[PDB]
């Protein structure tokens, strides 16, 4: 029935939106955590550079190529903020369905 | 075509479910890795506080405000556990 | 319900857009996290050097060593196959 199918479509939309919201929220929590941890790590490394000051710093002291952090904070937060906008609007829309 | 639309709804449901499960598994893997890394980092920091014991610890020695780790593990694990339950219970 | 076909393809399109945003973000998180783990293990090699005669960092602390749990390969493959499906779609 057409009205039956309308309700199934609305119901599918409602439940997929809820699952996408759970993922957006979790991805944004991971970004916040990971960025905060990167600040802890680079502060730890500033401490190591001071302890190794005589030897030219941590990476020189170890005689190794210096590893560096790859920061995607801006891109993830922009992407997830636009996703939140879409999901929140779709969520209020389907409260009527 | 009403019958075909019904199969269409079910087909879309199946396909989205498989993609949501892929993201759920990867989010959960990322959370396990990130949480394990935070314990490594904090252990490294305890070692640095030992090395800077006479200067009052790492952050005093550097004359900086201490950076703070923001932990969301419980919230991420609960969000994803509930999402796995909904995905599984609707699987028909 | 007369435009159900348009509603269904619309839903498919919207969800595809949202899954693509989540895939890109998960994959960026994976690259950042893996890079941070390399910085952190290099930091710990420095600490093990400073504590060499004590037997390294975790012995000097009198603690069991914490270790990094790596899922890079699994995440990358999962997200590669997802991108493969989403672009086909
Ligand atoms: Cl560290």
Author numbering:
A (entry chain C): 491 to 587
B (entry chain A): 491 to 582
C (entry chain B): 492 to 580
Paper text:
PERVs belong to the γ-retrovirus genus of porcine type C oncoviruses. Retroviral envelope GPs belong to the class I viral fusion protein family, which includes HIV-1 gp160, coronavirus spike S, and influenza hemagglutinins, among others. Each protomer is composed of two subunits, a surface protein (SU) that harbors receptor binding activity and a transmembrane protein (TM) that facilitates membrane fusion. A triggering event results in a conformational change required for membrane fusion.
A construct that included the residues 493 to 587, encompassing the heptad repeat region 1 (HR1), the CX6CC chain reversal (CR) region, and HR2, was generated. The third cysteine in the CX6CC motif was mutated to serine (C557S) to prevent nonspecific disulfide formation from an unpaired cysteine. The purified PERV TM ectodomain was crystallized, and its structure was determined by molecular replacement to 2.0 Å resolution. The PERV TM structural analysis revealed a canonical class I viral postfusion 6HB. The canonical trimeric 6HB is organized in coiled-coils, with the N-terminal HR1 forming the central trimeric helical core and the C-terminal HR2 packed against it. The PERV TM structure revealed an HR-interrupting stutter corresponding to 506VTED509, visible after the third turn in HR1. The conserved CX6CC motif forms an intramotif disulfide bond between the first and second cysteines. Thermal denaturation experiments revealed that the PERV TM was equally stable at all the tested pHs.
